[PDB]
A paper describes a structure:
Poorly occupied sites also exhibited weak 2Fo–Fc density for ligand residues, indicative of disorder when zinc is absent. Indeed, although the crystal structures of apo and holo CkAztD are very similar overall (RMSD = 0.22–0.44 Å), residues 99–104, including zinc ligands His101 and His104, could not be modeled in three of four chains of the apo structure. In the chain where these residues could be modeled, they were displaced from their positions in the holo structure. The C terminus including His405 was disordered in all chains. In contrast, very little structural perturbation occurs for ligands to site 1 when zinc is absent.
We have recently identified a periplasmic protein [name] in Paracoccus denitrificans, which is able to transfer zinc to the cluster A-I SBP AztC23. Here, we describe crystal structures of [name] homologs from P. denitrificans (PdAztD) and [name] (CkAztD), a pathogen of the carbapenem-resistant Enterobacteriacea group. In each case, the protein adopts a beta-propeller fold composed of continuous antiparallel beta sheets forming 8, 3-, and 4-stranded blades and containing a disulfide bond between highly conserved Cys214 and Cys231 (P. denitrificans numbering). Two high-affinity zinc-binding sites are identified, only one of which is competent for transfer to AztC.
Author numbering: 33 to 98, 105 to 344, 350 to 404
């Protein structure tokens, strides 16, 4: 049995739609408190709907878990996280860290408990409310350090804390810290001088700094995605360029110039040599990460000359591009890179995540 599902948040309405990615039919629509940004767990078993303006994070059991596969209907869980302006969500190996821009704490919990209907939260102090990020580790977390002076500015680095908020090592200064992603056993935080790279073995997590290569043009990264199946990061580097970073090689950086400005990007979790960038001209661009170049482009929507704009997700052998102003999802074959289908979604379909796979029953 093969099963994949899309989870789509409306830009304005407090709704999340669940769509069977394979035939387009609707599986559920969930009503939440506010418009949501969506994240999935690594296992794909839970979906989190972050509602910045409503002070809540809702949780969805996706209904697909695992090889052997167990398939149920998707369901809104009664577990909700509460706090002012929920922010960056980071999940790793079933450990969850939910940041709150308006709180003195981040909330750490575990996927296994969430799915069982349990809410077992550890609040870790982050010194001062700010727009930051928490990465969960075994018996530790990495949390951004709020800007001294103001604190409403971007954070100035990160540090290891134990789960009582106590600092462990020394601070890792990274001015203008913004942007985070995991790829394999390595987690990256971007800032004005480069990337913080985080790994954990059997002790405290270890942070090291990778400066932007001296050969790059002036610029820095403020958003990151992480490869799945091959270890790398993709960041923005100015509005019309991206950088590919290999954190395991000394020749770390490759710059790609886009023809027009970036709207969104995602990696391909199935064909790990590829990633995808959507640009304001309305094209989907295939990034061959090994060669460091755009290998092809295809027009998918009308231009969105830089509020809602398309978002990409990948499921099985298909790519899904939300077209909010046209109340639909465009579906392309990943291999041929051609449109094959469209799926209607009422309203302004915006953020999108996909889960699934295959297993015996």
């Amino acid at each position: 049995v093969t099963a994949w599902r899309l989870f789509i948040a409306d830009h304005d309405k407090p709704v999340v739609n669940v769509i069977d990615a394979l035939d387009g039919d609707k599986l559920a629509t969930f009503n939440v408190k506010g418009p949501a940004n969506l994240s999935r767990s690594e296992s794909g078993a839970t979906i989190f709907a972050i509602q910045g303006s409503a002070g809540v994070v809702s949780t969805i059991a996706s209904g697909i878990a695992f090889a052997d596969i167990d398939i149920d209907a998707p369901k809104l869980l009664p577990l909700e996280l509460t706090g002012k302006k929920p922010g960056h969500f980071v999940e790793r190996q079933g450990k969850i860290a939910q940041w709150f821009d308006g709180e003195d704490s981040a909330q750490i919990l575990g996927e296994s408990a969430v799915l069982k209907g349990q809410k077992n939260i550890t609040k870790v102090n982050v010194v001062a409310p700010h727009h930051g990020v928490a990465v969960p580790y075994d018996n530790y977390a990495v949390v951004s350090i709020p800007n001294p002076d103001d604190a409403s500015k971007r954070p100035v680095g990160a540090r290891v804390v134990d789960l009582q908020g106590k600092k462990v090592g020394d601070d890792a200064l990274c001015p203008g810290l913004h942007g985070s992603a995991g790829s394999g056993d390595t987690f990256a935080l971007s800032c004005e001088t480069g990337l913080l790279l985080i790994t954990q073995k059997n002790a405290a997590p270890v942070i090291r700094h990778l400066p932007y290569a001296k050969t790059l043009p002036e610029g820095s990264t403020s958003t990151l995605i992480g490869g799945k199946g091959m270890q790398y990061f993709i960041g923005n580097y100015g509005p019309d360029r991206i950088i590919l970073v290999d954190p395991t090689e000394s020749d770390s950086f490759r710059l790609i110039q886009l023809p027009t400005r970036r709207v969104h990007f995602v990696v391909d979790p199935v064909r790990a040599k590829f990633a995808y960038v959507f640009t304001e001209d309305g094209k989907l661009n295939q990034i061959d990460v090994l060669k460091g170049e755009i290998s092809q482009s295809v027009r998918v929507t009308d231009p969105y000359s830089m509020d809602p704009r398309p978002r990409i997700a990948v499921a099985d052998n298909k790519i899904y591009v939300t077209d909010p102003l046209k109340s639909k999802i465009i579906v392309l074959d990943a291999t041929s890179f051609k449109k094959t289908s469209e799926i209607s979604v009422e309203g302004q379909p915006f953020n999108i995540v996909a889960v699934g796979g295959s297993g015996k029953v």
